[PDB]
Amino acid sequence: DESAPITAEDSWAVISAFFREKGLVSQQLDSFNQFVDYTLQDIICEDSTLIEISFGKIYVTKPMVNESDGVTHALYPQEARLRNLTYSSGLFVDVKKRTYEKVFIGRLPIMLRSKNCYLSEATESDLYKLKECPFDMGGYFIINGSEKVLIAQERSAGNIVQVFKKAAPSPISHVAEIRSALEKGSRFISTLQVKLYGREGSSARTIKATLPYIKQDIPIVIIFRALGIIPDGEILEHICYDVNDWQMLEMLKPCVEDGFVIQDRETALDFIGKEKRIQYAKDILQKEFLPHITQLEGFESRKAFFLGYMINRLLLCALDRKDQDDRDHFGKKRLDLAGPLLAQLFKTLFKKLTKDIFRYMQRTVELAINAKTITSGLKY
Amino acid sequence: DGPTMREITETIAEAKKKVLDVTKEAQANLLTAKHGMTLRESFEDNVVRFLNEARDKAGRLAEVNLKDLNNVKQMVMAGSKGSFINIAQMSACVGQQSVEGKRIAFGFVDRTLPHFSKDDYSPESKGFVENSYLRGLTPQEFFFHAMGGREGLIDTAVKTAETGYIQR
Amino acid sequence: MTTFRFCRDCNNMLYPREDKENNRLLFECRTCSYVEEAGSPLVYRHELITNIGETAGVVQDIGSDPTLPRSDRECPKCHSRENVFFQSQQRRKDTSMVLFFVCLSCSHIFTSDQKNKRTQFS
Amino acid sequence: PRQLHNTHWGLVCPAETPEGQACGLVKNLSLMSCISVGTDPMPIITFLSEWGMEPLEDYVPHQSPDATRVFVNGVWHGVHRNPARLMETLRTLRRKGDINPEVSMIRDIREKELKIFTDAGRVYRPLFIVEDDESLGHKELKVRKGHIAKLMATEYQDEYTWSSLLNEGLVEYIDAEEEESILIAMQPEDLEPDVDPAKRIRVSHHATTFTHCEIHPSMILGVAASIIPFPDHNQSP
Amino acid sequence: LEPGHAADQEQAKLIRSAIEHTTLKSVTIASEIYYDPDPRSTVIPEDEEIIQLHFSLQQSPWLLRLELDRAAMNDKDLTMGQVGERIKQTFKNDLFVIWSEDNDEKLIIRCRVVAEEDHMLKKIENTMLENITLRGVENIERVVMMK
Ligand SMILES: [Zn+2]
Ligand SMILES: [Zn+2]
Secondary structure, three states: OOOOOOOHHHHHHHHHHHHHHHOOOHHHHHHHHHHHHHHHHHHHOOOOOOOOOEEEEEEEEEEEEOOOOOOOEEOOHHHHHHHOOOOEEEEEEEEEOOOOOOEEEEEEEOOOOOOOOOOOOOOHHHHHHOOOOOOOOOOOEEEOOEEEOOOOEEEEOOOOEEEEEOOOOOOEEEEEEEEOOOOOOOOOOOEEEEEEEOOOOOOOOOEEEEOOOOOOEEEHHHHHHHOOOOOOOOOHHHHOOOOOOHHHHHHHHHHHHHOOOOOOHHHHHHOOOOOHHHHHHHHHHHHHOOOOOOOOOOOOHHHHHHHHHHHHHHHHHHOOOOOOOOOOOHHHEEEEOHHHHHHHHHHHHHHHHHHHHHHHHHOOOOOOOOOHHHHHHHHO | OHHHHHHHHHHHHHHHHHHHHHHHHHHOOOOOOOOOOOHHHHHHHHHHHHHHHHHHHHHHHHHHHOOOOOHHHHHHHHOOOOOHHHHHHHHOOOEEOOOOOOOOOOOEOOEOOOOOOOOOOOOOOOOEEOOOOOOOOOHHHHHHHHHHHHHHHHHHHHHHHHHHHHHO | OOOOOEOOOOOOEEEEEEEOOOOEEEEEEOOOOOEEEOOOOEEEEOOOOOOOOOOOOOOOOHHHOOOOOOOOOOOOOOOOOOEOOEEOOOOOOOOOOOEEEEEOOOOOEEEOOOOOOOOOOO | OOOOOHHHOOOEOOOOOOOOOOOOOOOOEOOOOEEOOOOOOHHHHHHHHOOOOEEHHHOOHHHOOOOEEEEEOOEEEEEEOOHHHHHHHHHHHHHOOOOOOOOEEEEOHHHOEEEEEOOOOOEEEEEEEOOOOOOOOOOOOOOOHHHHHHHHHHHHOOOOOHHHHHHOOOEEEEEHHHHOOOOEEOOOHHHOOOOOOOOOOOOOOOOOOOOEEOOOHHHHOOOOHHHOOOHHHOOOO | OOOOOOOOOOHHHHHHHHHOOEEHHHHEEEEEEEEOOOOOOOOOHHHHHHHHOOOOOOOOOEEEEEEEOHHHHHHOOOOHHHHHHHHHOOOOOOOEEEEOOOOOOOEEEEEEOOOOOOOHHHHHHHHHHOOOEEEOOOOOOOOOOOO
16 A cells, blocks of 8 residues: 555665765765856855956866876876876856956866766766776866875864854853855955853943954944944843833943933944044944854844844843753854855965956056966866 | 573563663653753663663573583683673673763754654663674674774774883 | 943933932933933943843744754643753853753743742743 | 863764864764755745744744744844744644754754854764654654665665655654754663663653654764774773 | 761861852842832831831832842841841941841841942942852852862
C-alpha cells in the first residue's frame, strides 16, 4: 500500500537519493556557481560608472591558456596539473564609452567541477580519456599545478542583536551589539553598541550608545532627538512597548535626565560635534549608523524604532527577564566559502582596476587596462 | 551474567525514581535549599549524586561476577591496566556526562537538543548515559558524551602547555 | 506599581514637587510650566524579590508552539485536561523550579507551587 | 569557541577534529549538512506587506499589543496581527517550492517574533516533515513507503529525485536558528505509535507535537567518523 | 572552635552567625518612597499602629519605607531592633528611623531625611541596601559547618 507509513530501514533510500544528487562537496560547487552566475555580475555594477565609461554584462569563457610561440589553447585539469598551469577561464567585460566633459580583464581560476569546468558535463567514459578519475569529487582549484582548497571561514553572523553581560571590574554591566553589514555593495562593518553604565546598586544607571566616527558615547535620549523624536514618552514608546511595565520604565527615568539638556533636533544633531558639525551628524545617522535597513534619507523612524528595540532587549537582560545571548550558538554564525571569499577579493581588485582606468584618463589630456591586476590578484 | 544485567537495569531504574521524586518535590516547591546554595543548585547537586551513586553500584555489581578467569579482572588484579571505572563503563553503565562541572546545559533555548521539550531536567535530557560501551550509546547519548570527551581533549591540551611552562 | 504620568501639551515627563501650604503631591513638567495633582502618594517602588516575569510569553497561540511540554491536569476553572506548562520565565539564579500551566481551553494560568502567594500571577 | 556546542547537532561532526592545537577551532561538516548560498529578500519583503506586515512607519505600540514584529535578514520591517495564518502560508510556499528552500523562518511565539533569513553561509540540514494532516491515525511523516519504491525505482534504472522529495513537501532544510522551534523525532518507526535484554535501553516517544523526524541519526557524523565501525560502543575521544 | 568547645553543635552556630556577612538586601522584600507630609498620621493605613505606638516607655515630608521578609529574618539571627538600630547608627544624627516590632504581622521600617529629597531618599536607599552590614564580617560570604 503506497500510502502506508515507513520504517527506519527505508530512510537509507532517502539518503542514496540525497547523495545521488548533491555528492559530498556541494557546499563547494554551489557556493562557487552562485559567485560566477550572480555574485560576479553584481560586483561589476556598483562604483563602475566613472566621472562616462560604464560596465555592462560579464562573460566567462571556459579554461584557456595564453602561451608564447602559440595561440590560445583549451586547458584542462590534467594539463594544468602537469605543466603547473593555473586552470582559469576567460573573463570579458562589456564597456560603454559615452563621453562627459567586448573588453578583456584578468582570468578567473575555476572550481574543478562547477558549471564551467569541462568536467561538469563529461560522462564516465569521457573522464577516462581526459585522464581524470571518475571518482574525483573536485571542489578545488588548480593553481601553478597544485590543487588548492579554500577552507570554510567561520564568522559570527551580522545584522543580529545580541546582549552580553560584562565582567564585574568594568564600568559597564550590559551591552547590546549589532554587526551591521550590507549584504551587497561595499559591505561596511561598523558595529553599534548600546551600553548601560553602572551596575546593580549604582546611582543613576544611564544608557549611552557608541556611534562610529564619533569620539564619545551619546545618551539614547539625545540620539532619539537627533532622529526627530523629541518628547519623552514618544521616545519611551519606542523603547517600552507596554505602559504597565513600571520596572522597565523606572529604569529609563535616569535616561530622560541625561537629555534634559537638549530639547530639540537642532541641538540633538549639533551635540555631536555650528554648521560644520550638524551636517556631519545627519550624514552619520544616515549612512554610518544602523546602515543595514537603509542608508537613504527618509527612513529615520524605521531606525528610531530599532534603536528602541535594542534598548529593550538590553533592559530585559538587566531585569533578569531574559538570559544573556549565547555567543556559541551556531545559528548566529556563518561560514564564508569559496564563493563569498573570492567575492571579497574580486571587489578589492576590481576597485583598483577602476581606480587605475581613471588615472589612465587623468593623465591623458588629448586597451589601457592592466589585466594583470585581476589575474595576479586572484592567483597570489 | 544475565541476572547481573537485571540487577543493574533496575539499580538504574530506581536511581531514576529518586531523580523523579526529587523533581516532583521541587516542582511543588517543597525543596529546601542547602546553606549558601540555590534551590536550583542543591537540586542539581542532589540529582548528580543520585546518578554517580547509581553508576558506582551498577559497576560493583558488574565487577563482582567477573570470574577469576575474566581476563580483564586478571589485568586489574595484577595491576597492569584496568580499573573499576573501566569495567564499570564497559560492562555496566557508562555514566553521567558533564562539562564545566555540570550536566549538559541548555545550549538550545530551555533545552538540550531539539528532540526534547523545554524545561526538561530529567537524566535522559541533561546528560545521563544509562547504557554501557558493550550495549552501545543512543544518538542523544553519543552526542553529550561527545561534548564531554571533548572537554577532556581541550584542557588536556591546556594542562599540557601550562605545565610545560611551569616546569621550565 | 508606580505608574508615572506625562505633561499634557509638551508630552514630556512629570516630576514630583511639594505644596508646603496644603501638604499634597504635585507633579510638574520642568520643560515648560505645566502642573497637576498626583493620583497616589507612591513615588518609588524597588522590589528586590520581584515576581513579574514568571508569567511571560503567555500569548493566545502558546498552545500551538510544539517545544512546550504537556501534562493532563484540571485548572481550577474549566476542569479541562489540555495544559501546556513551563518553569518560571525569570532567568535568575534563585528562581524556583515551580511549574506554570496554561489551560488551553480557558486560557487560565495555574501553578504547582504549593505555596501560591500570587493572586494575579505576574 | 572550541567546545562541542549543542547546536552543532547534525551540522558539524561531533567527533572529527584535530588534536590539541586547533582542537575545536577546526571543524568538519556532517554528511547531510549544506550551506545557504544566498537569495533575493526583496520579493518576500514585498509579499509580507501584502498579507498584514502593517508597516513599521505607523506602528502604535500602545494601540497594537498582541501583534508580532517581523524581521527579514536582521531588518525590522514591521508589525503583524494574526501571524498564525501568515506562517502557514510561507510554510507551504517553501514546500511548494515557491520560497527558496534555503530561506529559514522562525516564529518565537512566546517572544512574539517572526524572523526570516536569506543570508548566505547559514549551515543547515534536511529533516523529514511529520505534519499530522491525517484522518486515519495520529501524526505521521508525509513520506510513505510508496514514495520510497518510487525512489528505489529511480536507482534501479541505473525520474524521482531528491529535489522531487523537496517540492512535494516531504522534506525541508532547517538551520540552527529555525531548529529552536521544532520537535524532532529520532527514528520514524519506534517513535510514532519481552524486550531483548541484549539491546540498548532507549527512552520513549512521549510526543504528540512532533514536527520533524531525523532522516537517520548516524547522519550527525562527518566523513572520517562515518568510517568507524560501532563508534557508539567506543569511548568518546 | 575554642578548645573546650568543639562539640557544641550550637556554638558552631553562634560563630558562623557572627562571621557570615549579612546585608540588609538579603532580608528586604521591597523599598518604597511615599509622599507622607504629616508625621502624625500615615497615608498608608497599615502603619497606623506603628506611628501611634512610637511614644511609649526637623523631619521631611518624604518617606522611605522598607518591608522585610519574616522568613529571611527568623533564619538569620535577626530582629527588627537589631536591624533598625544598625541602620539608625549608620546615619547617626540626621535620619529618623522607625520600625514595627517583631510582634506585628508585617516587618517594616520608615525613614526620613532631616529642596531635592526624592534624590537623597534614593542615594540613601542604595547605601542602605548595599553598604549597610547587619551581622558578620565583609568578604565572608558563605559559611558551612563540618564535623
Ligand atoms: Zn510641558
Ligand atoms: Zn480552564
